[model samples]
Target chain A: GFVVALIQGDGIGPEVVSKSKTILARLNEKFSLPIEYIEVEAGDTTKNKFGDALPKDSLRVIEKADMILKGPVGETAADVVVKLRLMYDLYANLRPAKSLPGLNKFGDVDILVVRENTEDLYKGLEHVISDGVTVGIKVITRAASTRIAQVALNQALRRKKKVVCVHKSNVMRITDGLFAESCRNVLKGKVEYSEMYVDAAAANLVRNPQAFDVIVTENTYGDILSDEAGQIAGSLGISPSANIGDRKSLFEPVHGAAFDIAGKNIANPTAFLLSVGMMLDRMQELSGDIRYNNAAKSLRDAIYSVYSEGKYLTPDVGGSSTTDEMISAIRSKIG
Target chain B: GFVVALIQGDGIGPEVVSKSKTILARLNEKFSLPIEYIEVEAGDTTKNKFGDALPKDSLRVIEKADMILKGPVGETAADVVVKLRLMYDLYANLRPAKSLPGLNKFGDVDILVVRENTEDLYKGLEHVISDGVTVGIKVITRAASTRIAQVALNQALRRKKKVVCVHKSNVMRITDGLFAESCRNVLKGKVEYSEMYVDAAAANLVRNPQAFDVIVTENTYGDILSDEAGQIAGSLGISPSANIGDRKSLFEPVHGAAFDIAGKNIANPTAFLLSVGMMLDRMQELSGDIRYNNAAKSLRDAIYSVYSEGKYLTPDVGGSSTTDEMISAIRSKIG
Candidate 1:
């Protein structure tokens, strides 16, 4: 049994989140999964009303919950998510840029990018050097690097059984060199290890993302690679991500708030729906219940069918169904 | 009328450079262009003989030449090219990820990426912060940002008149914020201006690279994006780049030294031949000579014919033709 904090975020976020819940409600009816959802207000409206996107009450609710289902934060909710990741020690961000039939011109791509979220340039270290110069510090720790590499290898045990460590160790030798060393120390005989320069990986990713299975990298480099791989898979709006720690895990969609398309009921909810798939997998892992895993597989199979069938998809994935109509389509397909 | 300092860099560099000369010799015969090629030894072999990859004599010759045609740098040549870009104040890196025939399945993608080369994390500022933590400094300046934006806009004048300023302004607000602000200031009403997060640009670059014309970005961000765009064009080995400044401009192929294939006659020469094309264009820009412009056009047309005719293409572009044979093919097609 678990309780999940469902955050209705900014602009188009609420629309997608609401659409996701419709799918979740149907999943619960089919599988009888033991869970309850707690609505958490955490976005621009929350910021305007409470002077903080992550209100203290919301944090209290998040702390009590076993997992979080987060929506996309808008323009004003910049620092809120960073604060949560730090607070919960969410060091590893697992983003899968898997292919969908409705998307991807390239042959089927399935890359699992494990980005170190805590360290690197995101450490908030910067200062003004002189009249016109400003320097930002990128921090890399052996502990963080070693653990992230371990996480990637563990995840790869279930996938294609290969991992590529991406870095700019040739130039940023001391920092990225230490990172590669840490990754090497943990991955001696556990998994297949190959290395690539960040620039080379970026170039190769677009050309042949299928060549990589699990790509573990530092913060900023992984951030860029994740989005690139996700978009290459077909639609950025169809990608889901998980920010995980030792105990707490946060699942979310890779797309933004999409403020331009707010309240149009045309915004694709595939990102959020697939995020639920990740949550279900996590639920099975945490609870040791086979039903959660089964539900995840069914949900994914149904979603894949929808994309391949080329019917009732939202605008982003080519079909012109409204948010409610798409939900029903997926729901009807769910056994 | 102009001197081109041809640097025979490392490994397969000599083979490719020799093939480029064959094309240039054919061009000179056709156009009757008064140009001199100065052989400059500046690579691993030179470092072993003279204690520096860039020897003083080679530097002297490079200083006297109006433009440089560089080959690939090897393992030991890390700072070699960076030094030249700085010495000549080559603040802007102009890279074209243009698609070629028999390459790219997702239609024709031609993107010009203008990267600011002099600053950012590439500045090489790093030190130990604590017991297990090390930090590298990333520097950004208003002057560098605005000038790079101006360079992109200036280049856009010859292209589609649109430039996307790519940055991580929302997170690294102080540093990248200044960069975006400077770009907006310089590009106001001068060209079509758009802003994208570095991650989102990485996404869009893979999904829709043709949607862009000139993309201006900071050092580290641009480095990865340049390679991604290059690879997306189908042949990273065949792409060309230009490092430009007020007094001087340097041109080179984007591929690295393939040391294992050094003595092999199967090395690709397309990248270096295109570098010659850029040098001729720069020559026309500097001297206002329509003859140089015409020669550049003819050289490019012949190279295009070599690729499209599919008779004598290099192994990199999916043909089995030797470097010498490919050069003969392009030479026969010269006007």
Candidate 2:
């Protein structure tokens, strides 16, 4: 049995996470998949309860799990995910921005952004230089850059066979220069590769998103670009991501915990459900389980089939359906 | 007479600069504007000729000018503009992303980006922390942040009564926290103000661009967001910008010297012409000259009139008119 650590985050997190759990339970029962879920507490709510967002007890439980499936956390998100990334060495943040039939905004896009998670400006190395001046350190490493590039290249090989390494090497010549150089070191003509400045990449993303297949960059740029991509792909409500390490991985929706619609049961569960789908795929990749692979496809097809029918969707996507209705429609489509 | 130092830069820079000069001369002849043009050499071409991209001789002439009107330089853009920014203390880099009637891609947007010019990661401070690790220092000063915020607030007062200060304070707490605090210090409730993370701002810009007015940010985020804004507003080919110091300011288009279309005469001169318009407005703002204001208005009206007619335009914007033809068409609309 694969132990799945589930962190039902704050606000609307519980609502969407409930729906995700329902889908996972359904998948397990139907496919006879050996999966055991352990609910772990984290985020702002957990901080209020235990005095620490990610308590030691919670970490102990999470560490035993094979993989993690998380809902969007609140303000204490960094205290949970960011700290977990460092502790677990979840270096590669993989976000796939693929166009759905009715969700695409700018142009048809199928771009996977492989972001380096553990380093760069995210290291939080900062200090006051003087009375009014402050300095933040952006650290780039060859090891981190190489691993992230490999992840992007690997993803591209499974998809478009092209990878665009994005960085601002022209400006920060030494740091991004090192980053660009590190990325280049790993390019042994395994796939079609190119380099683009971050500014041009953002602009071209809006102007011609179809041109990109896989984009690999450091933490900060990836954060901005992935959010932009999520919006362009339709809405962040359906965008899912994975934080992958050698031993374990964490999957989550791109959208935040919507506090406004938290207890109202109006929150869309598509992103969370899709995140569960991603977790299933990761499980298959790790265990070489054909059942997990088949289950992942069935879940994805069911979710996409619901959207294709356009009969049951949350109000956010121009449908009058509630969260429960949307989940039921998706589940009904599952074979 | 006010001397305008002209840097007719490399590749397509020369082509567009030539056309802009024609418009300036026509306006000068017709309106008796007290403006004298002095050509200065710069960019990669200048480096080959004078052994320096921005030689001491060129700097001397540029210093003599009342203001500078520059075309896009080549790869050494940083060598010229970036150097001048630091040398002259041009703290505010202003870029306006306004939608044109015929060219808008996303939504109707008229946002003025007030970017902190001299500091942040653009300061070129980096070193190898180890064989595999490189660190870049991102410096943020209260003085720089406060000035740029003031610029945004002032611009907001003129346009839409709102200013959105964009940063990533959640992650880079100390550095961006100081930046956010510095911007808040200058906020005397003169305009409607709000703070947004750079990631959220980028996504929101694509999702709903018309919601923003004047966006103030640090150097790096501003660089990426302005380009994204430019592309969202329409095309970067028609985007104009300025670098404002206390005494001297530099006016330039938010584009590059397109080497591929250098000698073809197919390059769009709209951005350069609009930049000239911005310079005129600045002249009026500084000198209190009604003639300068009228000239600015006339220049803008002429440009818009040509665009509205849609008869003569560059191939980039779906018309076959050459650079000269477009300039002539715009000039014909001038009163």
Candidate 3:
């Protein structure tokens, strides 16, 4: 049994969130997994009504849940995503930029970026130095670096068994140096591993997205590279990501709350549907349930099946199919 | 008359530095402009002969010159490129990722990436806070930010009249925020401009390199994006860059010294040859010499003519021709 919490968020967030729920329904029906679903709200609308964008009640629900699935929230993403990251020590941001069966434009991408989620300049350690100067501290530590390396190698060993650590040690020798050394020590002789400068990695991602198997990096470079990986695959509208730790995990689409497409029934739901696959994979890995494991694989097969059929797709993927229509196609594919 | 100092840096540097001069000799003969070529050295070998890597005498030679051309140096890049940038305040690092005929792996690209060369994380401002903890400061100021914007927009005004300012303002509100505002204020009415997060810009540059005209960014983002643009164009080995200030400018190949192939006459000199064109363009812009401007155009027409002819090219660009062979091919085309 799993207590799964769903945050519908705001705008097109509701559309994708609900469409993905239909996917979970089919998975539960087919696999006979006891899964409980609960919905929470966040973003600007919720902020106006409750005077707090990420209401206290919603945080309470998230804290108690065994699994969490989220959608992009408009104008209040900081209230939802940032707080969630800190509340739970979600220190490894896992993004798998696999090329869709039919939607990819150029390179054959299957890179998993294991980003150190909690530290670096993204830690909000900023200060105004003087009247005209300001400093945003890029913090890196041995502990965070060591753990993220272990996690990335742990994931890499399960797949292609290669890890490329990205950094800029030649320039920021101290900060990036510690980050590189920590990863090097953790991954020494463990997996087939290598190192690359962040700038060189950026060039290689566009040059040969297929060359990477599993990549580990700190916050800022990872933030930029994951999106770059998404672009290399196809469109951002079709990528899903997982934020995991020792306890409860979170999943979401890489695309944001595209406000203009809200309530139009034209939003792409593929990223959301694939998020269901990621959730089941996480469930199987943690609970040791083979049913959830196979469910993850079959869900991917279903996703590829729906996309390969080329019959239904959202406008974002070059088809005029409505949001629910694409959801229904993937649900029917679950058969 | 122009005094162009040639710095034969290290490794294959001497080879390319000597080879590009022959092209310049042809240019001088064609245009009848007395652009005196002076030879200077800056790399590891120079350190062995002299106690210092980038000696004071070399700086004197660079200062006296009207324009400069260089080759890729060895590991002592900090002593050469980094020191020169600070010494001369060469704020703008202009990288043109132009796709040549019969080259490029994917998109059609003619992008000019205007990198703010002086500031950001590359400023060498790093410190270890405590044992096992490190912080690197990313310094951004209005002075550096405004001029880079002006240079980028000024370059764009001559091209497509478009500029895209890349930053991460949504997160680093003060640092990246200030960088964005400075650029925005400069391009308010001068050009058709837009703003994008650094992550999004990285993705878009790969997805469609041709869509970009002139892109202005801070150090780290520009460093990564320019590399990405190079990959999109074809290869970094074929790319060239410029470090320009008010009076003096320096041109060089984007690829670093390939010591492995030094003196074998196998190192590609195409980047070095194209750098001559860049220098002439800059020389013409500053000196207001139409002859130098036309020479820049003709030099490119000759280089492209040799490339499209597919007769001779370095091994990197998929032809069997050696470095000297490619130089001869361009020389023949120049006539």
Compare the candidates by DockQ and give the number of the best one: 2
For candidate 2, the TM-score is 0.97
DockQ of each: 0.70, 0.83, 0.66
What TM-score would you give candidate 3 relative to the actual structure? 0.94
TM-score of chain B of 1: 0.94
Return the lDDT, model 3, position A140: 90
Candidate 2 CAPRI category = high
User: Model 2, A40-148: lDDT tens per residue?
Assistant: 9899989999999999999999889988989989878878888888899999898888766654466477788899999988878999989998998889888888888
Candidate 1 lDDT, A192-222, residue by residue in tens: 8888889889988876777889999999999
Give a tens-digit lDDT track for model 3, residues A107-208. 467889999988888766666677656668788999999999999988999899999999988678889999999999999799998998888898888767
TM-score of 1: 0.95
What docking grade applies to model 1?
Answer: medium
Task: Please list all clashing residue pairs in model 2, or write none if there are none.
Answer: none
Q: Give the better candidate number (2 or 3) by lDDT.
A: 2
User: Where does candidate 3 clash, by residue pair?
Assistant: none
User: Which candidate, 1 or 2, has the higher TM-score?
Assistant: 2
Q: Model 1: runs farther than 4 Å from truth?
A: B28-34, B55-57
Ranked by DockQ, top first = 2, 1, 3
Clash count per candidate: 1, 0, 0
If you score just chain A, what TM-score does every candidate get?
A: 0.96, 0.96, 0.95
Better of 1 and 3 by lDDT: 1
